[PDB]
Design an enzyme around this catalytic site. Structure first.
Site, PDB file in Angstrom:
ATOM      1  N   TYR A  18       0.811  -1.215   0.000  1.00 18.04           N
ATOM      2  CA  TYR A  18       0.000   0.000   0.000  1.00 18.04           C
ATOM      3  C   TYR A  18       0.850   1.272   0.000  1.00 18.04           C
ATOM      4  CZ  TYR A  18      -4.045  -2.986   0.567  1.00 18.04           C
ATOM      5  OH  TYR A  18      -5.026  -3.912   0.357  1.00 18.04           O
ATOM      6  N   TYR A 150     -11.528  -7.734   6.604  1.00 17.27           N
ATOM      7  CA  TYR A 150     -10.446  -7.760   5.630  1.00 17.27           C
ATOM      8  C   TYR A 150     -10.188  -9.204   5.225  1.00 17.27           C
ATOM      9  CZ  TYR A 150      -5.944  -7.257   3.314  1.00 17.27           C
ATOM     10  OH  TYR A 150      -4.905  -7.307   2.427  1.00 17.27           O
ATOM     11  N   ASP A 247     -12.744 -17.002   7.798  1.00 16.37           N
ATOM     12  CA  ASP A 247     -11.417 -16.629   7.375  1.00 16.37           C
ATOM     13  C   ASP A 247     -10.548 -16.530   8.634  1.00 16.37           C
ATOM     14  OD1 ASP A 247      -9.111 -15.539   6.499  1.00 16.37           O
ATOM     15  OD2 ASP A 247     -10.029 -13.880   5.368  1.00 16.37           O
ATOM     16  N   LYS A 276      -1.400 -16.974   7.701  1.00 16.46           N
ATOM     17  CA  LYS A 276      -0.261 -16.153   8.130  1.00 16.46           C
ATOM     18  C   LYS A 276       0.744 -16.871   9.032  1.00 16.46           C
ATOM     19  CE  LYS A 276      -1.722 -11.366   7.966  1.00 16.46           C
ATOM     20  NZ  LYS A 276      -3.105 -11.270   7.437  1.00 16.46           N
TER      21      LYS A 276
HETATM   22  C1  LIG Z   1      -7.468  -2.752   2.198  1.00 16.99           C
HETATM   23  C2  LIG Z   1      -7.261  -2.300   3.670  1.00 16.99           C
HETATM   24  N1  LIG Z   1      -5.989  -1.552   3.757  1.00 16.99           N
HETATM   25  C3  LIG Z   1      -6.060  -0.146   3.273  1.00 16.99           C
HETATM   26  C4  LIG Z   1      -6.371   0.821   4.416  1.00 16.99           C
HETATM   27  C5  LIG Z   1      -4.828  -2.151   4.119  1.00 16.99           C
HETATM   28  C6  LIG Z   1      -4.760  -3.532   4.365  1.00 16.99           C
HETATM   29  C7  LIG Z   1      -3.550  -4.154   4.724  1.00 16.99           C
HETATM   30  C8  LIG Z   1      -2.376  -3.401   4.832  1.00 16.99           C
HETATM   31  C9  LIG Z   1      -1.165  -3.995   5.201  1.00 16.99           C
HETATM   32  C10 LIG Z   1      -0.015  -3.207   5.333  1.00 16.99           C
HETATM   33  C11 LIG Z   1       1.215  -3.751   5.798  1.00 16.99           C
HETATM   34  O1  LIG Z   1       1.860  -3.138   6.655  1.00 16.99           O
HETATM   35  C12 LIG Z   1       1.704  -4.951   5.385  1.00 16.99           C
HETATM   36  C13 LIG Z   1       1.338  -5.724   4.348  1.00 16.99           C
HETATM   37  C14 LIG Z   1       2.080  -6.856   4.201  1.00 16.99           C
HETATM   38  C15 LIG Z   1       3.059  -7.044   5.112  1.00 16.99           C
HETATM   39  S1  LIG Z   1       3.033  -5.720   6.165  1.00 16.99           S
HETATM   40  C16 LIG Z   1      -0.116  -1.812   5.081  1.00 16.99           C
HETATM   41  O2  LIG Z   1       0.867  -1.077   5.161  1.00 16.99           O
HETATM   42  O3  LIG Z   1      -1.324  -1.279   4.684  1.00 16.99           O
HETATM   43  C17 LIG Z   1      -2.454  -2.028   4.586  1.00 16.99           C
HETATM   44  C18 LIG Z   1      -3.650  -1.416   4.230  1.00 16.99           C
HETATM   45  C1  LIG Z   2      -3.669 -11.201   5.712  1.00 22.65           C
HETATM   46  C2  LIG Z   2      -5.063 -11.715   5.595  1.00 22.65           C
HETATM   47  C3  LIG Z   2      -5.555 -12.199   4.289  1.00 22.65           C
HETATM   48  C4  LIG Z   2      -4.675 -12.121   3.051  1.00 22.65           C
HETATM   49  O1  LIG Z   2      -3.475 -12.883   3.136  1.00 22.65           O
HETATM   50  P1  LIG Z   2      -2.241 -12.612   2.127  1.00 22.65           P
HETATM   51  O2  LIG Z   2      -1.299 -13.760   2.386  1.00 22.65           O
HETATM   52  O3  LIG Z   2      -1.744 -11.251   2.535  1.00 22.65           O
HETATM   53  O4  LIG Z   2      -2.826 -12.618   0.719  1.00 22.65           O
HETATM   54  C5  LIG Z   2      -6.868 -12.663   4.220  1.00 22.65           C
HETATM   55  N1  LIG Z   2      -7.686 -12.705   5.291  1.00 22.65           N
HETATM   56  C6  LIG Z   2      -7.338 -12.307   6.542  1.00 22.65           C
HETATM   57  C7  LIG Z   2      -8.294 -12.392   7.704  1.00 22.65           C
HETATM   58  C8  LIG Z   2      -5.983 -11.767   6.758  1.00 22.65           C
HETATM   59  O5  LIG Z   2      -5.615 -11.357   7.988  1.00 22.65           O
END
Ligand SMILES: CCN(CC)c1ccc2cc(C(=O)c3cccs3)c(=O)oc2c1
Ligand SMILES: *Cc1c(COP(=O)(O)O)cnc(C)c1O
Ligand SMILES: CCN(CC)c1ccc2cc(C(=O)c3cccs3)c(=O)oc2c1
Ligand SMILES: *Cc1c(COP(=O)(O)O)cnc(C)c1O
Ligand SMILES: [Cl-]
Lengths: 429, 428
Positions: A18, A150, A247, A276
């Site tokens: 992101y 999420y 999930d 994870k």
């Molecule tokens: C779709 C929800 N959002 C946008 C507000 C997310 C969802 C997950 C992350 C994960 C993040 C993150 O720190 C990491 C993602 C993968 C390893 S660490 C991040 O910086 O921003 C996010 C933003």
């Molecule tokens: C992190 C996460 C995912 C997505 O997993 P990725 O390996 O980042 O694609 C899906 N569902 C939940 C609840 C999560 O915490």
């Protein structure tokens, strides 16, 4: 490469999660080592040891470089790195599948391995869609969830993520239009479940599945809800013939104080995703499990098969470490470990409740959250925690931790102290 | 577990690629070891060594358990298994991204790491969609491709896979409806490109991107097309302002005889995906690369960021073994090796042309295909090839191989001989 050369290459060529290219408010910090609960990071050209309070995004439940997990990897490496799962099977896949079906909620009898949580969610959705098609009901193709969730970043996964948090504004009509119930409350309110049922009732004939994170919603806002809602969901789903998908990609493997979060309610979903912490944070691997009935209905349908098969499906190396990670978890008194961890988080985070910028303090198993009254500035928070010997990465208004299970009581108190100090700073501007 | 026990657990509990549970016509074969170009498989309860003719689904380009790649993994393991890529960076990511930007077609300056091919394809699509939103043209959100393609199994990726191959018939109403041109032909025909352009032109205002596999279409039918088609697509996309995406997940890293199949055409896409052979077949890793223009436009857009971030993004272990794999390829005369392999495939498959059930024999770099006039029975074909010391997995009417680059001439002779024999049995 030196740390400064890594930074140069990174700024020019590397996307982060992101993130932008060229518009980052802060450079990423260079990591040069990880051992046990500790990361070696570069700060002002000097290596410092800091606690991995985030478990490297929920993954490092046994900490880094655990001898059992390192050895599992090297032992498997010596015999077979990888073979294609099309037409072949192997011991690591069989061992892990056996373990997973034994320890997950009852009835989850088949295992589809993939390479990431997002993919495992799409696999779960595919299972549900092919299921209903096998039942002669292809109208049942939509998904229902509650807000605040999420489920990953692939396009079907995004369609059930919280619409505001994921700015679904950006997407659509490219995203599938799914059914959203209101945010699930923290405290049990029978009225919420009644309204959930009433909403579901309006869509039952077009719904393949309800998909939720059980007990804890992670990336959508570190919110907890009463496990009784999950009991209600199971009952609603049974009565309206909608599949229930949990999930557990974030919640799995002891993180919430139960082996799986579903266990807090005694509930079995029809389909479940894990990911994870599955490999103890060494390698990417995920799994989607479903009941025998789901598997047999798909297998008897027009396709005669689940129409999915990732290149590295059931990768021997990833499966081997995962076998060792799960066995390591089950071979100790993990429940007492997590309870002690939660007590440490609770005791250590108490003083935050009195801080001016703090709205809530909440703990659930090895998860500790300080909810602030404003978005946390990372340019202030991150170095403040590093000064206190802790790697913390707030998101939105939350200062939170999901520490490795191997953290000692002293290490947990160091983590919570840093979180308190970050929260104190948030209220200083 | 013993092989017998593995089979029992497997039949009860394991999904396989595009498979059933409880309805498999044949049990999968137990694999117990993999070393170099050989797998040890269990046959009649005994371990036998057979050639991995498929490179384990395109992955094992340097063979299994290559000392340099084993060492790369082991070395990284002692230092740092994994850290989150949110707010941190590390040497394996930086080293790999530098390598990947240097060796890919000109102009691909930024690298987004993910954990699989299908995800990298959805990342590519996300880049395209965010790019055009950033340009103030949100109507540009559809994808165009030609038929015969495969791009992965996630729902967006499925929407650009061949409608017949992908059984889109079973997906009525759930997949995005994309724009399909007719199957791209083997031989270059300017009339095909002119028709492609005319179809694109009428959809240009709603198209974010053209997405194709360059030169070789893999899982959709092992079809080759003239590289000049890619030259035309680059031209069409430039002129009609539609992004060009090459999916090099199967073709990358020397497999078609060029380092990347785009190189045959001398053309650069706006966005490129790589995956299968990236780690030399050790671990799941993929990457989506895009130009600086794409990256800057996304970053100045409304989100201010590419809205994607997988948990294991840029995993140190996978990145470390990939660096070693890519360096191993670049530090040898890979071009000559692939040429020798292609020559070996051509010579060994020649007699199959005469066979009664064979409609085509074709080779492209380290890829050899016998196309038959009927479905190949796996129940017959697979033990037939095993009898001959070769692991082969036909699909549909195709008996084919993508052998490891380390295969000696004797090994290619053995693979091709077995392939010819499978084709012979098809004619029976
Ligand atoms: C779709 C929800 N959002 C946008 C507000 C997310 C969802 C997950 C992350 C994960 C993040 C993150 O720190 C990491 C993602 C993968 C390893 S660490 C991040 O910086 O921003 C996010 C933003
Ligand atoms: C992190 C996460 C995912 C997505 O997993 P990725 O390996 O980042 O694609 C899906 N569902 C939940 C609840 C999560 O915490
Ligand atoms: C969507 C195209 N199809 C036809 C239904 C595919 C695509 C890919 C595969 C991959 C298969 C496979 O052999 C492997 C998948 C991953 C490692 S090996 C397979 O058996 O069937 C497929 C079928
Ligand atoms: C295999 C393949 C994909 C998908 O890769 P996975 O890692 O199996 O998800 C995408 N595109 C092409 C051209 C492929 O050959
Ligand atoms: Cl060009």
């Amino acid at each position: 490469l030196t740390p400064e050369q890594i930074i140069a290459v990174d700024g020019a060529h590397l996307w982060h999660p992101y993130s932008s290219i060229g518009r980052e408010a802060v450079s990423p910090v260079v990591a040069v080592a990880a051992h046990g609960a500790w990361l070696t990071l570069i700060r002002d050209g000097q290596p410092i040891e800091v606690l991995d309070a985030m478990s490297s995004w929920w993954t490092a439940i046994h900490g880094h470089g655990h001898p059992a997990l390192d050895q599992a990897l090297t032992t498997q490496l010596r015999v077979m790195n990888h073979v294609m799962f099309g037409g072949l099977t192997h011991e690591p896949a069989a061992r892990l599948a056996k373990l997973l079906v034994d320890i997950t909620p009852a009835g989850l009898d088949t295992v589809f391995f993939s390479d990431s949580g997002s993919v495992s969610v799409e696999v779960a959705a595919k299972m549900a869609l092919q299921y209903w098609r096998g039942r002669g009901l292809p109208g049942k193709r939509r998904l229902m969830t509650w807000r605040g969730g999420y489920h990953g970043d692939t396009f079907l996964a995004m369609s059930i993520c919280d619409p505001h948090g994921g700015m679904h504004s950006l997407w659509t009509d490219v995203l599938a239009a799914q059914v959203f119930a209101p945010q699930v409350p923290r405290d049990y309110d029978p009225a919420y479940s009644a309204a959930f049922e009433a909403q579901l009732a309006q869509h039952a004939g077009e719904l393949a599945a309800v998909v939720v994170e059980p007990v804890v919603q992670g990336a959508g806002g570190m919110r907890f809800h009463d496990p009784r809602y999950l009991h209600d969901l199971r009952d609603i789903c049974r009565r309206y013939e909608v599949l229930l998908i949990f999930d557990e990609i974030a919640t799995g493997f002891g993180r919430t104080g139960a082996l799986f979060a579903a266990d807090h309610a005694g509930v079995s979903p029809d389909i479940m995703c894990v990911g994870k912490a599955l490999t103890g944070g060494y390698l990417s691997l995920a799994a989607t499990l479903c009941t025998a009935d789901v598997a047999h209905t798909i297998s008897a349908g027009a396709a005669g098969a689940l129409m999915h098969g990732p290149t590295f499906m059931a990768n021997p190396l990833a499966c081997a470490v995962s076998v060792a990670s799960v066995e390591l978890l089950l071979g100790q008194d993990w429940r007492t470990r997590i309870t002690e961890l939660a007590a440490g988080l609770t005791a250590g985070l108490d003083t935050a409740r009195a801080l001016p910028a703090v709205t809530d303090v909440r703990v659930c198993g090895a998860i500790g959250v300080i909810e602030c009254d404003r978005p946390v500035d990372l340019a202030v928070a991150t170095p403040a925690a590093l000064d206190r010997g802790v790697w913390l990465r707030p998101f939105r208004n939350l200062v939170y931790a999901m520490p490795p299970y191997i953290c000692t009581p002293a290490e947990i108190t160091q983590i919570t102290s840093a979180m308190v100090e970050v929260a104190r700073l948030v209220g200083s501007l």
